[PDB]
């Protein structure tokens, strides 16, 4: 799907600040654009307009058919890591360990006993927060979706993993699928199609890494 908004404003309080301020922007069907911003500037709450729990007070927005979301907040549910990470969704072999793969899960479940059927949140094994990270991850990219938004996904990772895993997974892995990655680091802004940085909600600077460095 290809996703536009348009002079959006939207408020979180009627009556209040507005959250996010005439914003535009426009991907195309598989292309990644990547949101930055500091503490507050209205990054997910973007997000959560496009999962229709924000609505505009101004303005367009187009995008359509299925959402796959990995909050900034890592999550497990009681259940083995592979359960962890179809969460309900059809098992297919060679899915599931392409993403495994592309998340570097593969070398952590390779030194669990119970390899994928290690039992994750019933007060086993407590994972890491790069771990519980790298699963969130992987959980929302194994879902097949028109449209992956991807919230600072990274956490607690150290900068070189997480420059390879936005390598394997965002740009490899997920090539061919409209994404909108939440980031601020250098080198996914310069390999995204588009990039957005907010700034206490209004459009700090929209367009391409290329035109920003033009701008130095
Ligand atoms: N569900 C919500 N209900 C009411 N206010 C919200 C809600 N979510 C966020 N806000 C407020 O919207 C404003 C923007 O917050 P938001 O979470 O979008 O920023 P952010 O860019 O994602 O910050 P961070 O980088 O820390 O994750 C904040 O003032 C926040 O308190
Ligand atoms: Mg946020």
Not at 80 to 98: A, L, P, Q
Not at 146 to 174: A, H, N, Q, R, W
């Amino acid at each position: 799907t290809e996703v536009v908004m348009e002079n959006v404003t939207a408020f979180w309080e009627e009556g209040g600040t507005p959250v996010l301020k005439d914003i535009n922007f426009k991907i195309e069907r598989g292309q990644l654009l990547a949101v930055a911003g500091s503490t507050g500037a209205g990054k997910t709450s973007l997000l959560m307009m496009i999962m229709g729990e924000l609505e505009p007070s101004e303005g367009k927005i187009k995008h359509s058919g299925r959402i796959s979301f990995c909050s900034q907040f890592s999550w497990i549910m009681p259940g083995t890591i592979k359960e962890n990470i179809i969460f309900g969704v059809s098992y297919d072999e060679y899915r599931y360990r392409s993403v495994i793969k592309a998340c570097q899960l593969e070398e952590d479940i390779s030194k669990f006993a119970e390899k994928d059927n290690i039992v994750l949140g019933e007060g086993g094994i407590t994972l890491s927060g790069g771990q519980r990270a790298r699963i969130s991850l992987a959980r929302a990219v194994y879902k097949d979706a028109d449209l992956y938004l991807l919230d600072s996904p990274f956490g607690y990772l150290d900068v070189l993993t997480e420059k390879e895993i936005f390598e394997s997974c965002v740009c490899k892995l997920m090539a061919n699928k409209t994404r909108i990655l939440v980031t601020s680091k250098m080198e996914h802004l310069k390999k995204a199609d588009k990039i957005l940085i907010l700034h206490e909600g209004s459009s700090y600077f929209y367009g391409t890494f290329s035109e920003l460095q033009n701008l130095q």
